[PDB]
Design an enzyme around this catalytic site. Structure first.
Site, short mmCIF file in Angstrom:
data_model
loop_
_atom_site.label_atom_id
_atom_site.label_comp_id
_atom_site.label_asym_id
_atom_site.label_seq_id
_atom_site.Cartn_x
_atom_site.Cartn_y
_atom_site.Cartn_z
N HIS A 1 0.82 -0.89 -0.02
CA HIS A 1 0.13 0.49 -0.14
C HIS A 1 0.67 1.28 0.15
CE1 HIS A 1 -3.54 -2.02 0.42
NE2 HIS A 1 -3.03 -2.93 1.45
N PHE B 1 -5.36 -1.49 4.66
CA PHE B 1 -5.89 -0.80 4.57
C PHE B 1 -7.51 -0.62 4.06
CE2 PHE B 1 -5.10 3.01 2.01
CZ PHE B 1 -6.76 3.42 1.44
#
Length: 124
Positions: free
Chosen positions: A12, A120
């Site tokens: 991420h 996330f």
């Protein structure tokens, strides 16, 4: 084993580019980050902010995670992100993605000591 924290960075973080590089960004990045090794991971978001700025979200706005856990945090500021979404005609192992740039608040799950992003959850 790869730590949960390192795995979040791999999946991420992309602080090197300030916004979704090209139309080919997701196709290169989903592959180089190993998100196409076993299957085509269908959706994935990259964050174009410093590691410190993303880690700091863990002390920002506490919000419910999508799974009902209470350890998610929404960024007070908006952040530069790229969403990667699998095309209709993408077929593993040739995984294909549309690369979309946005500026949004991110929501991350945090865990550990130190208390750092490990998942996330969303962008809003």
């Amino acid at each position: 084993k790869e730590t949960a924290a390192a795995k979040f960075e791999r999946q991420h973080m992309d602080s090197s580019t300030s916004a979704a590089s090209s139309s080919n960004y997701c196709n290169q990045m989903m592959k180089s980050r190993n998100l196409t090794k076993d299957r085509c991971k269908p959706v994935n978001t990259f964050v174009h902010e410093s590691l410190a700025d993303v880690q700091a979200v863990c002390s920002q706005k506490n919000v419910a995670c999508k799974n009902g856990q209470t350890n998610c945090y929404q960024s007070y500021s908006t952040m530069s992100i790229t969403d990667c979404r699998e095309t209709g005609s993408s077929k593993y192992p040739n995984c294909a993605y549309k690369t979309t740039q946005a500026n949004k608040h991110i929501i991350v799950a945090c865990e550990g000591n130190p208390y750092v992003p490990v998942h996330f959850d969303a962008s809003v």
